[PDB]
Structure formats: C-alpha cells, structure tokens
Amino acid sequence: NSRYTHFLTQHYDAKPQGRDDRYCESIMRRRGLTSPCKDINDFIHGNKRSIKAICENKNGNPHRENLRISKSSFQVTTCKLHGGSPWPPCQYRATAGFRNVVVACENGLPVHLDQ
Template identity: 35%
Template structure:
C-alpha cells in the first residue's frame, strides 16, 4: 500500500510542477504582448523577449496601454475574452542574426486568457497575414 501512495504522490507532484512551468504570469504577458512605449520596430521589441540563442518565430504586440489591457480581466477569474484593438505582428525573417518584419493591423480581434483578474495569455491570432 505504501508503494502505491508514493507513486501517486510523485505523479501528483509532477503534474503540479508541469502546470506551474506552463503557466504564464501577467508580467510575462506584459513583456511579450503589450507594445512597450517608444518601441519602433519588431527587431527592437523582439530583442527583449527572445531567450538566449533563440529567435521566436512570430509574436503579436497589442498597441494599448497596460492599464487598459489589465482592466479587461479585472472582474474575470479564469475566463477567455475577445477584444478588438490595433496590433503589430512580428514575423522572423532570419535567425542569425534574429531579424523580423512588422505588420501593423487595425481593429483586429484577439483572444486573451484571464486568470485571477489578470491577463496571462494571448491566444494565437488567426488574422496573421504572413
């Protein structure tokens, strides 16, 4: 009986750790998906989110203020919401060095995952025109 309990505990621990690793925080969402003030090009913006020795293939930035995006999830626990806004899609054109092209899009619908009243994930946009 003790062997089964240990295996069950180990499986539960592994499951919980996996969920924690996959979860995204509001700070990560903000860094990866809200257009930083003063940023002009995808090449500049992507330098801040690419990890060492990697070039993310594509990324979407919302052209809105942090407070506006945060307010969308204010009364939501674990909901997915739709929002229409201007965005910038960045698509990788080369890996060494990492280079990107910009696509400015107006009034595009995006889907945002809210957790505990904060935006934490931007669903892959279906509108990307690359």
C-alpha cells in the same frame, strides 16, 4: 503574478514610434525572444488598464472555451520571422494592424495571448 508579468514582457509595448521591420528586430531582442528566434509574436500597444479590463465585463466577452475577447479594438504589431534559421541574427517582417485581442485570464489578470 509571474504569468501576468511574463505576458507584459512578451506582449506589451505602450507607445512605439516606428512599427516597421527594424522595430520588430529591436524589440524582439530587448524582450529576450531571440535565443532562439521566436517564429511569430504580437505586441499590443495603448494603455495597460484597457488590456486588464478584458478580464472584466468592462472590456471583454466570453470566447470559446476559457478565453475572452476584447470589446474594443487595439493597435497590435505582429512580428514574423523571415529566413530559415532559428538563430541570430533574427530578421522580422512587421504588420501594423488593428483588431480585437483574445486572452486567457486568471485571478482577473491576462496571462496568455492567443495568436
């Protein structure tokens, strides 16, 4: 698993078209993160197998206490809440970045994104 499933719902979108403010506003609503508005949330893009592989030597290294960092870089879109209210409509500003990602793994599956 349930935590791996939750990780995908909250943090994975394979192939976005736009990666702009409108995208953030749409996907945050679709993934159930707007009641109340989540303040910051990252979405990782690309192939699911590469993300799972962070949990193995194939695409990851030990990081800090009990986390793992990816060897490869990923396209990641950060959505940051704008305005002063916790309640909809939730307005977001998007950053379309590219970087290594840090996760915690359990039984070989990512279950938490650091962020």
